[PDB]
Paper text:
Ung (family 1 of the UDG superfamily) is the most prevalent form of UDG and removes uracil bases, regardless of their state of base pairing or sequence context, via the cleavage of the glycosyl bond attaching them to the deoxyribose. Ung inhibitors (which are interchangeably referred to herein as UngIns) are DNA mimetic proteins utilising charge-based alignment with the Ung DNA binding cleft to dock Ung. Docking promotes the hydrophobic sequestration of the sidechain of the apical residue in the Ung DNA minor groove binding loop, which is essentially irreversible under biological conditions, to inhibit Ung. UngIn protein structures described to date fall into one of three observed folds: Ugi/SAUGI (note that Ugi and SAUGI share the same protein fold at ~12% sequence residue identity), p56, and Vpr; yet, within each fold, type there is pronounced sequence plasticity, to the extent that the unambiguous identification of an Ung inhibitor in any genome is rarely straightforward.
Of these, the most distantly related to structurally characterised p56 proteins is a sequence encoded by Bacillus phage VMY22 (“VMY22_4”; Gene ID: 26625151), with a sequence identity of 23% to Bacillus phage PZA p56. The VMY22 open reading frame sequence was synthetically optimised for E. coli and recombinantly expressed. The protein was biochemically validated to act as an UngIn and confirmed as a structural homolog of previously characterised p56 proteins. PZA p56 and VMY22 p56 variants show structural conservation (RMSD = 0.883 Å) despite low sequence identity (24%). The primary difference of note is a deeper inhibitory hydrophobic pocket in the VMY22 p56 variant, due to tryptophan in the 3rd β-strand functionally substituting a helix-located side chain that is a phenylanaline in PZA p56. In VMY22 p56, that phenylalanine is a cysteine and does not form part of the hydrophobic pocket. Other sequence changes do not contribute to significant observed structural differences. Furthermore, crystal structures were determined for each variant in complex with Ung and revealed fold conservation with PZA p56, SAUGI, and Ugi.
Residue numbers in the entry:
A (entry chain K): 6 to 56
B (entry chain I): 1 to 225
C (entry chain J), E (entry chain N): 4 to 56
D (entry chain O): 1 to 56
F (entry chain M): 3 to 225
């Protein structure tokens, strides 16, 4: 199973980052989540081919 | 929600059961159990205290609130009834346990064996509405579970506290007696476990302390069912 | 950090029954603990900071 | 449910020409209310998320 | 404006069958045209700007 | 080129160009591998039903409806038996507002095409459940040519351009004898910003009366 991952962060200076990934395993999304030290504004995992 | 405690917890917590906050919590939960599905079953709410007396407590493992799905919670932090899938947090606990002792991942998440050997599996919040995590946060439960921690703090025989994540670690403010042992790391959740839970060796750290106190070590192995 | 999130998720159990959950005023750590409790298949997991700006 | 009007959670993020940013979260919005709100936005849309309340 | 969006939506037909659709590189106007084509029940409608920052 | 009317000769040279041959190869593969709409035999129905000679009004769309039993080679129209898409329902509501016609029980617009309404999508195929899947494959070179030819026509042509993507085709309508009717798209996400009250139908018929041409009967019958 694979996920689209969309997330938005903000660092201590107030600078903002948008990342969009496709075809991420559950585990890859969990590894990426664990690397983030900046403030999370959005974290959105969506299963590819739900139905 | 009555004081059904059969062991030394009964007398020790008697004054908590007569406070106003507890009466209002009990009335709230009486309504909640009539109207909604609440977990765990009312008779299981205090099982952590029932299985693990004040006297026999060696290690406290704090959780949040009970699992919020059918046939999961039975009044212990982290444990699930036999028959259901192991939650990822507990699977990660099992993976750290495999890493320490070579034990295979058990076919169940039932941790009564830990409680029987003096592991107090205490959630800070002891009820939850079905499918609504933290639905019963700020209703009085943490006045009650704070008192459980305060009492263990006042105990002369040293207590080991395992505090996984910041919310569990915030309870250090109650653990003022420096004879007690504090084991800390990030939470075993898949979203945090790789930031220090894997390799934290909580199990052998506990048993090292129990050996240095002349106390019987804990057999952490969970049998298949 | 304000550390208060809306948490919106959709799960599916082994029978194919589906759950739509919206929680508000969750800490980042509470969202992480909830994620660790879920054994059902996760279709959507969406954390949104309350009062971003 | 059957016999009742559908309602939506609405989450959106906009940015004006100066680069100033707005986050709004609304609950219990009709489809039509979400459509009216969408039509009022002249700023840049970064996120528009309508979610049916009680999908199942 | 960059005017390029990811469009993620979930619909349900009269039989209760469900569709998960992800489109990329859509203009705002293309998202509006697609919305106007949909007769099924909309469960989720999510527009996300590509390269926000 | 299965075109049975005056479009056949007029577009013959378009069908022999490199871009069209590569589009045709792409669509041959796409129809084998995936579900594509509309049916291959329906792709050009807008031109088949509405000749160069008989064209009075062009209503541009995007790509065909991308669900089963919907598209049949006309912009906005759906086959009988399926729900009216919200864009078409809004068109029906503006029509009720103009003439008092009740909302029909179908979205089938062949009656418009038979009276000289060219219902032309700019993109004429789509993969099932993937809007704009056939954007940038060559279709707009082909539909641009259809618009260019109508621009070169002596007898004035009325162009209805709903939304900016349709309106971008003004760059091809250089002959100032032609009539351009413009507004926001009838999509529910844009219709309230000027589609309601825009009276596209009576604006067309006002122009057809001033040219001595037979007016369009916009009424869609129930089936």
């Amino acid at each position: 199973d694979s996920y689209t991952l969309i997330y938005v962060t903000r660092d201590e200076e107030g600078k903002m980052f948008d990342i969009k990934l496709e075809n991420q395993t559950k585990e890859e999304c969990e590894i990426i989540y664990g690397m983030i030290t900046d403030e999370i504004l959005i974290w959105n995992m969506i299963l590819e081919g739900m139905f | 929600m009555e004081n059904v405690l059969k062991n030394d917890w009964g007398p020790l917590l008697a004054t908590e059961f007569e406070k106003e906050y507890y009466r209002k919590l009990a009335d709230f939960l009486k309504e909640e159990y009539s109207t909604h599905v609440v977990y765990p079953k009312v008779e299981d709410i205090f099982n952590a205290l029932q299985y693990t007396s004040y006297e026999n407590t060696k290690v406290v493992i704090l959780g949040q609130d009970p699992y919020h799905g059918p046939n999961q919670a039975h009044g212990l932090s982290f444990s699930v009834q036999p028959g259901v899938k192991t939650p990822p947090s507990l699977l990660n606990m099992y993976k750290e346990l495999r890493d320490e002792y070579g034990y295979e991942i058990p076919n169940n998440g039932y941790l009564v064996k830990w409680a029987e050997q003096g592991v107090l599996l205490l959630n800070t919040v002891l009820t939850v509405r079905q499918s609504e995590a933290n639905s019963h946060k700020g209703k009085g439960w943490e006045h009650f579970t704070d008192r459980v921690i305060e009492l263990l703090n006042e105990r002369e025989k040293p207590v080991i506290f395992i505090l996984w994540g910041r919310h569990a670690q915030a309870k250090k403010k109650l653990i003022t007696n420096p004879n007690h042992h504090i084991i800390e790391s990030v939470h075993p959740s898949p979203l945090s476990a790789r930031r220090g839970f894997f390799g934290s060796k909580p199990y052998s750290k506990v048993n090292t302390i129990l050996a240095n106190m002349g106390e019987r070590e804990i057999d952490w192995e969970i049998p298949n069912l």
